[PDB]
DNA sequence: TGTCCCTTCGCGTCTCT
DNA sequence: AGAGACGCGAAGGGACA
DNA sequence: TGTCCCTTCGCGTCT
DNA sequence: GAGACGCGAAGGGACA
């Protein structure tokens, strides 16, 4: 109770009583809250756990941790208890939407601003509630909402943006800055020898915001002339968060990396056109000679690994783990590169290192299969999900390990496996598909929505044959099923 | 003081006489055509070049030679084609068909030389494809349109927000240079002062006379929307055609005359005006409605329907002339005459029914109803003549019933579908095992020809993107959405995989 | 007049759902 | 299949040399 | 310092 | 294979 106990002691005391219901927090969730919301947020969570989880709020422990774990966490926790009922009962927002709004730094501010501005933004011929929630669901959500309120009319009338484009620009961290900068720089950027309005909107909408736009304004002429890049390549580099950083890094490193038998400008653009393109470029500069000597990789492979987001993390992890993977696990350098060459390459590699024994011994997969699974984006998720669901998919649903590996071996493998698990019985028992056909559908990128679109059109239809529908689902997934509505209708 | 043109006419007739012989064998129509547009010098150039064009290494058909010759400067275009056709086909990768297409307009020489000179910079420095460059070149003033596209493509995309496709669409009309410069000047005025989207502006600009239509929408939009009570959408719709300027001015004149004196709505007036020759259709309605509706004759709504299409004026006058004979001597109802008249080329279809209804019925065993159905689409004349031509071979050689032939014929582009079925049915059925019924079903839709061609393309040079579909699935798709469905499916597979 | 360019009208075909 | 979009050719005027 | 806001980076999924 | 989209984590400046 009431004392001047020190910070850590205060924390561990609050944590002590937070081990059981309604909210049993672990060390992980505790640390998570501490790192952003602080001991303040931990104390808030303690103080309010019963009200937060009880009626009529009924928030889960996960939702509570999600709100608590940001700067101003206590403020957001206090504010949602007030405003969730209001926003839900008076404005028809879902609790999920309200929690989404609250789960950012300064969430209190965003929630209060949605309360105030939702009635003025969502009048006739205005924004949809969904658009308002999207805009509010970022740090500085209040600033973004007030700025859309202000500049929506001039951006649409004077510059001819659609409301949808204005929302796209606004729906990022620093959205207020992106909107004001678009409004200022459109005229200057969109002249002969500049960018198209479409390109400026892309830059403003992809997360690099104000910084990326100002840096393009500044560096376009020299990057396009002295550095020989096309405007399109400059826009590609700028069209990520931290675009400014990547652009300045390309300006600095182009005359380094593009020397005799170095990289091409196109290779440099490729490396830089990812989140953290700066880190990826600098790491290529630093590690290309050593990965090629020590670990036997080629410059082409190094560029391949660098050419995704998490480039730096993947390159450093290859440098660190290629030996053990090759020796303690008998993989080849080409296999390690294949696992590394995706978003999350680092995670994929560490998960292969951790999980390859249990999967090959206890589950009887081949290292080749494990590598196949790991060699996509989200590879870590796919590995862990195969570990989790292999036995239930094979035992209860009658699949072969080969089929499970097939479902797992694309981007979104986790989602595909979980969806197959959900929907295999209804597709087979109610609509007469085979497990082979379900597996066929699931075994592509976009497997999950392909399966959901097919169970949708099969449960209540608007016609091609079922086999034709399965064939379309395999060929182009959900988009194929939707694009055939745009005809038969 | 003899007529000055006497010697010229005489020379013309001498050479023209000589051209009926090998290796060209021009008929009277072709010769007349060439004289009328290319002139005596064009006829003479055809004579002098006959051997160089016919066989040699060009292998132009006589129809192609006639198409190049029959324009202002046709002599020049003939010289330039024999010079640049090989250059453009092997240095730039164009087909001879594309080269002839570029050649076949006034100032064809200019267009060919400008394509030779600018195709590289337009494809490399500007990102255009050769198809797009050929499309821009393939109109009168094509040289001007190409140079203007080069000059203005960046400022139209960057300063004004157009896509390259939009710029190409604007440029790909006679007077394209004029339309491009006008869009440059007027897009901000039309968009910001009047609330038009750039899409509406491109739509107005993308016709022959684009510049005239844009300047006229600028001038008349305020008067038409405030006073006459038209919406901007309706004004854009009127403007969005060749002779847009003439249509808009005529709508301003005749809107209140038509509404007050005949009880038309503004929407009906807009519909009449929103065709090529909208002006003509309006003036003819004002003139002819009382006559046609006379003695409880046609109803006003019927007159409006006839006028609400392309060649409105021609259709109205032809109906005035031919309703009696068609109804009396041929036994059509006036309802059927109206249906036949209510399409682009209504006049042509009416005349062709008058001529071919007795033959198609007696010689080919069709009903008048079948003849009317064939006639009652755009290009009805072409479909009727094609049915006359191909009914015997489609039935006797390919096993189709007359009912099937009629169904193929009874859509827009029916001539095309019929000719393409005649051409492709043997390979579709014998070589790939489609049934005649499946071929007939694919062809019995608007766009039947390209749907059939898409299908044959996929069966003879399989694209991996479509291999997951069986022949029957390909058929169902082709029936549902024609070539566009097939093409859209390819893209879907590319993204998804 | 020969040649180039532009506008208007009539007519024919395909696409979009 | 109803409405809109796409697109070819004939034919006349301006312009100039 | 905690709260707010903006920027940058890593990662996962779908087209 | 590349590119678009969007979630969450972290770092740091302003500020009262
Ligand atoms: Mg990938
Ligand atoms: Mg003339």
From TrEMBL, chain A:
The keyword Repeat appears for this protein: yes
UniProt entry keywords in alphabetical sequence: Host nucleus, Repeat, Secreted
Name this polypeptide is given: Hax3
Membrane-spanning residues: none
Full-sequence range covered: 231 to 720 of 960
A GO-annotated cellular component: host cell nucleus
Cell location: Host nucleus; Secreted
Claim: Cell membrane is one of the keywords in the record: no
